[PDB]
RNA sequence: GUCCCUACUGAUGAACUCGUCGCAAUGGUAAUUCAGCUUAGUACGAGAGGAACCGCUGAUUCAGAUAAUUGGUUUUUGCGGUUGUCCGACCGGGCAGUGCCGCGAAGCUACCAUCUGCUGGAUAAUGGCUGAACGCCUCUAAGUCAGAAUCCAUGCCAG
């Protein structure tokens, strides 16, 4: 089993959640909620709607160029089973998880580092 | 193929065969087939092992990658370079000015409330 | 189709009950009984051994 | 032999009797018109309906004039009404579409335009052969 | 509708009664039949199906399951019945020492204004060397009775409910001599019994309940006995990883994100049972064993779980844990303002 | 060696099976009769795997590959890939591809040397097939039928094509493939050769409705059952063919 | 299942034959009829399908 | 060209000190049909063709529940957009018997969603065993075995 990502919003689409739409040319869209489904059907741009990770990636609200993110990718070449290999892999999963959280904290902070100066200037005014 | 022997159902010492094993171990909707019996692995005891699939909202099969330890060590090395660089170093009159601004806003809200009152 | 109350269907169900489900339920009953048993062990008149009286009608009052 | 498929699981039926359908094969018909459903159960005033992989009897309403106004068996490959697959996935297609099929289960055409339902591909081996996209 | 359930009428009691215990023979080991629990809600699971001959064999199937919070039951009594030409007759009953405040509230109607004087003379009987009388009643059950039941009550104080009044019922002991079962009950006095001990994983059981009222003639509040429901899991509450499987290594409880809607959090032993169950959330449930040996392969199947849904039930939710939500989300204005 | 079998009661073998020079894939369902026929004809000489693709039994029409590799559609899940990898030796490269035309067994026909593909596959997919299979990939339609995977069965010893292929098309295809081709039928007049048959260099498994003349043609074309079977048998003993398929 | 007091054997004097003996004529005869009735052909041609278990000889042990 | 009485059926209810746990007279009664896999291309058959019992998996109808999921309904007038007119303008709003539109929780719903539907005895036709009538014979006369979705009960609902 896999965790899918919503086409419209990118939130983790877990099993038995949302509707999939199949069009005739051969592509499938997995939607995680009725909101995303209805918005896609009424043809709004996810890149324009401000509540979508696609919009965030377009507007540079998210960390998008980083090795701890390059560590994850869709696999198309199966690898033979190895117990130690998933064990060290799971320890990795934890390591990468905490690293991603801590890098994202720093990215958010270096985005809005300058707020106090503006607030104090407005208060002086 | 050339060194092979024809299967014949009347032969006494045939091959065991899946029909015979399922008929011996049950029927058609009763026999349960073990799909890992033909699994050729490095260690033969690693069969019948339960595969991890999800670890806190992320996919083990998507994060699974041969030769990942070198990439991991490179990752902690980059982390080391980063804190030593300082990527992670956290950095009264203004407080009273802000307090006075908040008091002025409260007074303006009271004035607006009185204006809507009358 | 044969009814749920058919004699042959009942005979088949009896055979199934005697051959497979019987043993399976007996094994589970043994396990649960062992667990509950472990959880449990986790003069006549003035002793109670002689059962005496505590503290409309069937016969016509004489 | 009645063209009632065996082993078909429960799914929502969204194409009732008298239903207009797109035609997905290269047979010369563009639309079909469901008039009857194989394997249906006649209830009080209940309209029979069929889901993906169920044989129906359809009449062509537009297409090649030689085949126009003719009645053939068909099996439906695409359903816009959402339904759930046993992996818990509710899904639907863009339109309603089927293919003309003989009572044994062989297609008159040679190709299928667009995707084919997984249920139909599993039930009818010929459609699995004439299918290019399976979803 | 069905003339079996008609004339349709409200259930005379809120608890719901068993009305039939399984037939008893001495050969089987000594065991209890039924249990109690409180419906918490429903969640979604997936199962590595191992049903031979099915279209979904060796595949993953999404099924809906119900959660019943099952705090341990306390044994407070032992009832002895006899056979008569008019039927079964409750010959005697024997109570224990130290009846709980919740079962005393069950006995009382206006507990707050009452002087709580219940079972005080029975306690004096036990403690003041009228153990002769207690043993006399016990031996009467030993030698005159044929079927023996145990009085048991739940822990409302452990179930997260505004109520404080416990539910008492008789659970029949099967599989043994009357002497063995009376000794078993007397040993079970003043002890908690566990749902993992009364039932186990992979066991089709019977659920007895009262249907949801559909009023504001009678629609609903109807006593039903639904049969053949496969218990899929028994969770320990203190395991801290009840919702975890061997396929996903997520340390999470059965309680969804934000808690069960209109019920709360399940912090006790719980039972995860396939399918739908009569009754609304927080309603009392009765769990008993099948009256007959089963006739289906579905009964002998072994349920291999893969994952358990812990997403929010209060709306279209999509995160199993708050940790997952904060990892997907990052940091917020409130978090930086607080920090 | 030509044999006759049915999946459950269906004559379509190529829909439920995929046979190559190094492995065999069998659809998993109910009994073990299909797997038993395949193993009794391949007594552990090459691995045989009970597999499902996209949760279906049409693995034969959904999988394409040769002795050197195997390709699966993007819909196939990671557990199915793990099963395939664990059942198949390392000398076989398995890859999952994001083709718009998911029916790989219907759009690709590949022996150990050449592959014929639907003309509408993507460029990335074309050279990824050329990479994984290590063969020469050509785009062509047979008998004006665009589904070569369902309308042709190919091996390293021969190839059976649609019964209504022209002589010009047939000899052109023979020139490109490099093996002899004969237009013949399978399962009593059925035109879906690929969907009704799996064949390799030393085994063919057709349906139970396949008639004796066309079975003999199949054996001759694929040079099976030892004997001679060059196709010269087909040319020489033409009386049976002209009498039966007149 | 036989009535109590009935001995059943597959004697190695002739092939495809069984001997059912005992003390009670009623029990022995009822058992023989029980096997004969349980091996009955259904929905077939009586003139064509000649399979079953039939009583061939009747007598005394001594 | 002439609103009452009673029946059905819930829901209440005085008298037995209140309350808790139970028994079960009596009344009602529920499941139905089809298909697929194996048997088996087997028995049978010149050929064409072609089963059944055991086992297994589904589906129709009927019945009883249920809301994880997925659709639908909005007086939540919840959030957002918008027309006429008005509060001197903005914000904020009133009126148009809920102005219209988009999304919309909770509730409720839907074979538009999902779960569950269970076992003993006596028999009818009929097939018998032993055996008289009637020195043959006979399933019946005395005695007795089996057997239908039938009947009576359990399971189930009421008390
Ligand atoms: Zn969404």
PDB file of C-alpha atoms in Angstrom, chain F residues 60-167:
ATOM      1  CA  UNK F  60      -0.785 -11.518 -19.695  1.00  0.00           C
ATOM      2  CA  UNK F  61      -2.281  -8.537 -21.524  1.00  0.00           C
ATOM      3  CA  UNK F  62      -0.875  -6.085 -18.958  1.00  0.00           C
ATOM      4  CA  UNK F  63       2.776  -7.231 -18.886  1.00  0.00           C
ATOM      5  CA  UNK F  64       5.378  -7.079 -21.647  1.00  0.00           C
ATOM      6  CA  UNK F  65       8.939  -8.332 -21.519  1.00  0.00           C
ATOM      7  CA  UNK F  66      11.500 -10.806 -22.786  1.00  0.00           C
ATOM      8  CA  UNK F  67      14.292 -12.980 -21.371  1.00  0.00           C
ATOM      9  CA  UNK F  68      16.354  -9.879 -20.549  1.00  0.00           C
ATOM     10  CA  UNK F  69      13.680  -7.804 -18.816  1.00  0.00           C
ATOM     11  CA  UNK F  70      10.104  -7.199 -17.738  1.00  0.00           C
ATOM     12  CA  UNK F  71       8.007  -4.029 -17.840  1.00  0.00           C
ATOM     13  CA  UNK F  72       4.893  -3.277 -15.795  1.00  0.00           C
ATOM     14  CA  UNK F  73       2.397  -0.378 -15.973  1.00  0.00           C
ATOM     15  CA  UNK F  74       2.390   2.506 -13.511  1.00  0.00           C
ATOM     16  CA  UNK F  75      -0.803   1.165 -11.898  1.00  0.00           C
ATOM     17  CA  UNK F  76       1.033  -1.898 -10.545  1.00  0.00           C
ATOM     18  CA  UNK F  77       1.726  -1.470  -6.843  1.00  0.00           C
ATOM     19  CA  UNK F  78       4.953  -1.732  -4.876  1.00  0.00           C
ATOM     20  CA  UNK F  79       4.008  -5.038  -3.242  1.00  0.00           C
ATOM     21  CA  UNK F  80       3.431  -6.574  -6.675  1.00  0.00           C
ATOM     22  CA  UNK F  81       6.807  -5.223  -7.791  1.00  0.00           C
ATOM     23  CA  UNK F  82       8.416  -6.717  -4.676  1.00  0.00           C
ATOM     24  CA  UNK F  83       6.789 -10.074  -5.427  1.00  0.00           C
ATOM     25  CA  UNK F  84       8.073 -10.009  -9.001  1.00  0.00           C
ATOM     26  CA  UNK F  85      11.583  -8.987  -7.942  1.00  0.00           C
ATOM     27  CA  UNK F  86      11.780 -11.655  -5.239  1.00  0.00           C
ATOM     28  CA  UNK F  87      10.505 -14.382  -7.579  1.00  0.00           C
ATOM     29  CA  UNK F  88      12.668 -13.421 -10.556  1.00  0.00           C
ATOM     30  CA  UNK F  89      16.469 -13.833 -10.657  1.00  0.00           C
ATOM     31  CA  UNK F  90      18.855 -10.882 -10.934  1.00  0.00           C
ATOM     32  CA  UNK F  91      19.573 -11.663 -14.607  1.00  0.00           C
ATOM     33  CA  UNK F  92      16.161 -10.109 -15.373  1.00  0.00           C
ATOM     34  CA  UNK F  93      15.611  -6.362 -15.029  1.00  0.00           C
ATOM     35  CA  UNK F  94      12.121  -5.335 -13.887  1.00  0.00           C
ATOM     36  CA  UNK F  95      10.885  -1.769 -14.362  1.00  0.00           C
ATOM     37  CA  UNK F  96       7.583   0.076 -13.985  1.00  0.00           C
ATOM     38  CA  UNK F  97       6.750   2.582 -16.719  1.00  0.00           C
ATOM     39  CA  UNK F  98       4.261   5.447 -16.921  1.00  0.00           C
ATOM     40  CA  UNK F  99       2.734   4.719 -20.309  1.00  0.00           C
ATOM     41  CA  UNK F 100      -0.538   6.349 -21.262  1.00  0.00           C
ATOM     42  CA  UNK F 101      -1.489   3.093 -23.030  1.00  0.00           C
ATOM     43  CA  UNK F 102      -1.461   0.904 -19.927  1.00  0.00           C
ATOM     44  CA  UNK F 103      -2.042  -2.369 -21.834  1.00  0.00           C
ATOM     45  CA  UNK F 104       1.622  -3.145 -22.420  1.00  0.00           C
ATOM     46  CA  UNK F 105       0.859  -6.727 -23.440  1.00  0.00           C
ATOM     47  CA  UNK F 106      -1.516  -5.298 -26.040  1.00  0.00           C
ATOM     48  CA  UNK F 107       0.784  -2.549 -27.372  1.00  0.00           C
ATOM     49  CA  UNK F 108       4.181  -4.308 -27.311  1.00  0.00           C
ATOM     50  CA  UNK F 109       5.338  -7.587 -28.856  1.00  0.00           C
ATOM     51  CA  UNK F 110       8.957  -8.409 -28.071  1.00  0.00           C
ATOM     52  CA  UNK F 111      11.237 -11.372 -28.643  1.00  0.00           C
ATOM     53  CA  UNK F 112      14.864 -11.465 -27.458  1.00  0.00           C
ATOM     54  CA  UNK F 113      15.921  -9.481 -30.537  1.00  0.00           C
ATOM     55  CA  UNK F 114      13.198  -7.089 -31.709  1.00  0.00           C
ATOM     56  CA  UNK F 115      10.087  -5.343 -30.429  1.00  0.00           C
ATOM     57  CA  UNK F 116       7.070  -4.047 -32.346  1.00  0.00           C
ATOM     58  CA  UNK F 117       5.182  -1.279 -30.563  1.00  0.00           C
ATOM     59  CA  UNK F 118       2.002   0.750 -30.952  1.00  0.00           C
ATOM     60  CA  UNK F 119       2.853   3.880 -32.975  1.00  0.00           C
ATOM     61  CA  UNK F 120       1.483   6.154 -30.236  1.00  0.00           C
ATOM     62  CA  UNK F 121       3.887   5.372 -27.390  1.00  0.00           C
ATOM     63  CA  UNK F 122       6.035   8.160 -25.997  1.00  0.00           C
ATOM     64  CA  UNK F 123       9.675   8.816 -26.885  1.00  0.00           C
ATOM     65  CA  UNK F 124      10.789   8.337 -23.281  1.00  0.00           C
ATOM     66  CA  UNK F 125       8.968   5.009 -23.201  1.00  0.00           C
ATOM     67  CA  UNK F 126      10.426   3.949 -26.550  1.00  0.00           C
ATOM     68  CA  UNK F 127      14.058   4.285 -25.528  1.00  0.00           C
ATOM     69  CA  UNK F 128      13.336   3.054 -22.012  1.00  0.00           C
ATOM     70  CA  UNK F 129      12.021  -0.138 -23.639  1.00  0.00           C
ATOM     71  CA  UNK F 130      15.122  -0.185 -25.831  1.00  0.00           C
ATOM     72  CA  UNK F 131      17.205   0.130 -22.646  1.00  0.00           C
ATOM     73  CA  UNK F 132      15.448  -2.445 -20.451  1.00  0.00           C
ATOM     74  CA  UNK F 133      14.901  -5.082 -23.141  1.00  0.00           C
ATOM     75  CA  UNK F 134      18.072  -4.354 -25.112  1.00  0.00           C
ATOM     76  CA  UNK F 135      16.271  -4.823 -28.430  1.00  0.00           C
ATOM     77  CA  UNK F 136      15.467  -2.827 -31.563  1.00  0.00           C
ATOM     78  CA  UNK F 137      12.071  -1.149 -31.246  1.00  0.00           C
ATOM     79  CA  UNK F 138      10.001  -0.520 -34.383  1.00  0.00           C
ATOM     80  CA  UNK F 139       6.597   1.143 -34.709  1.00  0.00           C
ATOM     81  CA  UNK F 140       4.245  -0.649 -37.089  1.00  0.00           C
ATOM     82  CA  UNK F 141       0.647  -1.794 -37.486  1.00  0.00           C
ATOM     83  CA  UNK F 142      -0.246  -5.325 -38.584  1.00  0.00           C
ATOM     84  CA  UNK F 143      -3.348  -5.990 -40.715  1.00  0.00           C
ATOM     85  CA  UNK F 144      -4.308  -2.345 -40.096  1.00  0.00           C
ATOM     86  CA  UNK F 145      -4.747  -3.433 -36.463  1.00  0.00           C
ATOM     87  CA  UNK F 146      -2.922  -1.064 -34.151  1.00  0.00           C
ATOM     88  CA  UNK F 147      -2.784  -3.521 -31.219  1.00  0.00           C
ATOM     89  CA  UNK F 148       0.213  -5.628 -32.223  1.00  0.00           C
ATOM     90  CA  UNK F 149       0.446  -7.071 -28.698  1.00  0.00           C
ATOM     91  CA  UNK F 150      -2.948  -8.725 -29.055  1.00  0.00           C
ATOM     92  CA  UNK F 151      -2.810  -9.465 -32.790  1.00  0.00           C
ATOM     93  CA  UNK F 152       0.625 -11.105 -33.019  1.00  0.00           C
ATOM     94  CA  UNK F 153       2.597 -13.793 -31.192  1.00  0.00           C
ATOM     95  CA  UNK F 154       6.364 -13.728 -31.669  1.00  0.00           C
ATOM     96  CA  UNK F 155       9.306 -15.923 -30.700  1.00  0.00           C
ATOM     97  CA  UNK F 156      12.969 -16.342 -31.605  1.00  0.00           C
ATOM     98  CA  UNK F 157      12.012 -19.220 -33.937  1.00  0.00           C
ATOM     99  CA  UNK F 158       9.002 -17.749 -35.714  1.00  0.00           C
ATOM    100  CA  UNK F 159       5.896 -15.624 -35.524  1.00  0.00           C
ATOM    101  CA  UNK F 160       2.147 -16.078 -35.932  1.00  0.00           C
ATOM    102  CA  UNK F 161       0.296 -13.053 -37.303  1.00  0.00           C
ATOM    103  CA  UNK F 162      -3.324 -12.078 -38.017  1.00  0.00           C
ATOM    104  CA  UNK F 163      -5.012 -14.464 -40.483  1.00  0.00           C
ATOM    105  CA  UNK F 164      -5.995 -11.550 -42.736  1.00  0.00           C
ATOM    106  CA  UNK F 165      -2.552 -10.025 -43.227  1.00  0.00           C
ATOM    107  CA  UNK F 166      -1.641  -9.325 -46.840  1.00  0.00           C
ATOM    108  CA  UNK F 167       1.347 -10.975 -48.499  1.00  0.00           C
TER     109      UNK F 167
END
